[PDB]
Design a protein around this ligand. Structure first.
Ligand SMILES: [Cu+2]
Ligand SMILES: [Cu+2]
Length: 440
């Protein structure tokens, strides 16, 4: 009731159990005024939002109705890599049931998408993605309970002949960006706010596009990062979300009006094609053009809630026992991507660590583009980037590295097993930039 806003259908746990059969299938859909056949979970783009509480059991049966093998990555979930298995392959026409328990202290916005090496980027770009929300007791404090809540899945697209556009040679180098910059599968929707305080869960599910988010005339109050709450709200004028990252922000609408949520120009180091121009700057692509993501209409006589004065304290982490160095490098013309000089080999274990210890990881981008580093299974705390302190304390699972930047991460190793780490420009992952961590 009231004004409608496009948002994925929500499937909720009941009595402590979320049991759901989800088919991955080609799906004709309406999109941006046309019809296209996408690859979808549950017949929708984005896929359905799964909403659970801590200690819930999830029993998701993935039914592969695609022409190719696939699997699922439960991005950001600290569960067993025997469940979240990057090496599993579900052949066409077969099913696989993922069963896990939500950890007791987890909260925030997570997501699921394909992770079959070599085919991640076409499958993700074709529409296979959805959100997972873990509710928290903190959602009951009045300063968040009475906020108007929405999920915003940021995902661009390009169509050719009624289907996802094919990957080009330039796409394997740069990562593929599309011309349709969508929110919850819609082109520039309008959100008619009914409350003056909004709580927006933000998910960058794009293959490679960055979103330098800014709301006209308003700051954002960051309350959650990828994997959990901040310790207290952090006011920002703008918020960069790299591929795979999530955030939750509060918006405090002071005045009536219509305000644009935009993705401001950002230069992630993508390389352009040659032949020569008239001026000076034409090898690098340069900054993205600004994009309007949605229109936000404030309610009448808006009086926003006060901000919560605290959120969730971040646990002391023990002293680290090992330091690791992971150097990212690129060969742009061959479109091959390396960690410590090697490309991914699923038969090769690159790092061996101990369960129940903390390590420091130093991840160094010795390339010229931004690379957003993701580690499965083990959330981390970003200490510093470029030798300077990270602006907040919260669990992250993707950290963006600009050219030459070195991130120092505190990585508590939880579950035993073999998992991966990789760039979340998924084309780069497909083309080399992935390694294997084994915890014992
Ligand atoms: Cu992911
Ligand atoms: Cu990369």
């Amino acid at each position: 009731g009231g004004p409608s806003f496009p948002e994925p259908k929500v499937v909720r746990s009941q009595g402590g159990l979320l049991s759901l059969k989800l088919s991955a299938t080609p799906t004709p859909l309406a999109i941006a005024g046309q019809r296209a056949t996408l690859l979808t979970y549950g017949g929708s783009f984005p896929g359905p939002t799964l909403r659970v509480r801590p200690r819930d059991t999830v029993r998701l049966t993935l039914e592969n109705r695609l022409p190719e093998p696939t699997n699922l990555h439960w991005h950001g979930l600290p569960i067993s890599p025997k469940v979240d298995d990057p090496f599993l392959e579900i052949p066409p026409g077969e099913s696989w049931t993922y069963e896990f328990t939500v950890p007791k202290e987890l909260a925030g916005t997570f997501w699921y998408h394909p992770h079959l090496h070599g085919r991640v980027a076409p499958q993700l770009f074709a529409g296979l993605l959805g959100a997972l929300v873990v509710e928290s007791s903190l959602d009951a404090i009045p300063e968040l309970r009475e906020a108007e809540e929405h999920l915003l899945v940021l995902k661009d697209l390009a169509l050719q002949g009624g289907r996802p556009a094919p990957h080009t040679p330039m796409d394997w180098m740069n990562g593929k960006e599309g011309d349709l910059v969508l929110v919850n599968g819609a082109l520039r929707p309008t959100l008619v706010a009914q409350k003056a305080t909004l709580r927006l869960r933000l998910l960058n599910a794009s293959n490679a596009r960055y979103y330098r988010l800014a709301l006209q005339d308003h700051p954002l109050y960051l309350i959650a990062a990828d994997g959990g709450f901040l310790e207290e709200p952090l006011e920002v004028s703008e918020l960069l979300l790299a591929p795979g990252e999530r955030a939750e922000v509060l918006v405090r609408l002071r005045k009536e009006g219509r305000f644009l949520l935009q993705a401001l120009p950002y230069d992630r180091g993508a390389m352009g094609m040659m032949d020569m121009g008239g001026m000076a700057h034409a090898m690098p692509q340069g900054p993205s053009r600004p994009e309007t993501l949605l229109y936000l209409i404030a309610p009448k006589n808006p009086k926003p809630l006060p901000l919560p004065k605290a959120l969730s304290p971040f646990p002391t982490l023990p002293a680290p026992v090992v330091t690791r160095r992971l150097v990212l490098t690129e060969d742009m013309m061959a479109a091959r991507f390396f960690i410590n000089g090697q490309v991914f080999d699923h038969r090769r274990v690159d790092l061996k660590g101990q369960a129940q210890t903390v390590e420091v990881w130093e991840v160094e981008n010795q390339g010229d583009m931004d690379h957003p580093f993701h580690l499965h299974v083990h959330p981390f705390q970003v200490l510093s980037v470029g030798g300077r302190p990270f602006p907040y304390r919260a669990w992250k699972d993707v950290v963006n590295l600009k050219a030459g930047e070195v991130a120092r991460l505190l990585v508590p190793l939880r579950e035993k097993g073999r998992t991966v780490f990789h760039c979340h420009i998924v084309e780069h992952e497909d083309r080399g930039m992935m390694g294997v961590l084994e915890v014992g």
